[PDB]
Design a binder for this molecule. Structure first.
Ligand SMILES: C=CCn1c(=O)c2cnc(Nc3ccc(N4CCN(C)CC4)cc3)nc2n1-c1cccc([C@H](C)O)n1
Ligand SMILES: [Cl-]
Length: 259
């Protein structure tokens, strides 16, 4: 087995319908990697589509400091294995949970740094004519601080996109409406709600009234003291008109975030 041969398994760091992820050290180089191991999807299935979106995302993107680096992918014993960068900080989602417990927080300065850094990653993805389509805390990973976009299984072309809808909680209305003429702006919407989660918002709605209230352009209630100017920024990032939301490039060059 290549997996056993090339790597020694240290720790299971994730599990779910995606299978399992393991912290592994690669024998040859002594470095740490996160390796996803899953059953090879049934041919013709959503799972196979998602897996192909991921393979061909790596084929296009190469390497960037706000994107989780992809190293290799193979199949064996009817399983597939994906070897990625190990981000020693876990996901933003884990860090938010930890904050909700110890009890610490992301204040304004930290939130702005998160917006900029993930924004840089988006900027790069979009310039390669791709969109991520599943931005959320559990898909943002931390190295220690560097924030990096991972989990590329929903990535698709700005056109023609094969749209597998992301998490309903972070999903823009126009995507739900089968309008895919400005998909980059859906990544922007999701990022803003991602930053709102980091700022300590209650769990985001999956549907019903408050869900629609957000797509009407209204920020979920936050628990802390944010500037009117940072607020306005997040507000326009979920503007019902995706053309009014800033592009990634407009985002990374904004006075509020700069530095
Ligand atoms: C390879 C697949 C995707 N993936 C990365 O690319 C990737 C990069 N870095 C890391 N670092 C990392 C993550 C979690 C932890 N924990 C340590 C303590 N635990 C009890 C809690 C968690 C420590 C370090 N994890 C990553 N991936 C990963 C890990 C888990 C679950 C999922 C799902 C698919 O979203 N993905
Ligand atoms: Cl666009």
């Amino acid at each position: 087995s290549r997996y056993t041969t090339e790597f020694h398994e240290l720790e299971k760091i994730g599990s779910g319908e995606f299978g399992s992820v393991f912290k592994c050290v690669k024998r040859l180089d002594g470095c740490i990697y996160a390796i996803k191991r899953s059953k090879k999807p049934l041919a013709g299935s959503v799972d196979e589509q998602n897996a192909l979106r991921e393979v061909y995302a790596h084929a296009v993107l190469g390497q960037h400091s706000h994107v989780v680096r992809y190293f290799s992918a193979w199949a064996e014993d009817d399983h597939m294995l994906i070897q990625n960068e190990y981000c020693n900080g876990g996901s933003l989602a884990d860090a938010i949970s930890e904050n909700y417990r110890i009890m610490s927080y992301f204040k304004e300065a930290e939130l702005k740094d998160l917006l900029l850094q993930v924004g840089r990653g988006l900027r790069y993805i979009h310039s390669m004519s791709l969109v991520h389509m599943d931005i959320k805390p559990s898909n943002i990973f931390i190295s220690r601080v560097m924030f990096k976009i991972g989990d590329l299984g929903h990535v698709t072309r700005i056109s023609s996109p094969q749209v597998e809808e992301g998490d309903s909680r972070f999903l823009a209305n126009e995507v739900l409406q089968e309008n895919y003429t400005h998909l980059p702006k859906a990544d922007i919407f999701a990022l803003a709600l991602t930053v709102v989660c980091a700022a300590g918002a209650e769990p985001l709605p999956r549907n019903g009234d408050q869900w629609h209230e957000i797509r009407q352009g209204r920020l979920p209630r936050i628990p802390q003291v944010l500037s009117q100017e940072f607020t306005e920024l997040l507000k326009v990032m979920i503007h019902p008109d995706p053309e009014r939301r800033p592009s990634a490039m407009a985002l990374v060059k904004h006075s509020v975030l700069l530095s």
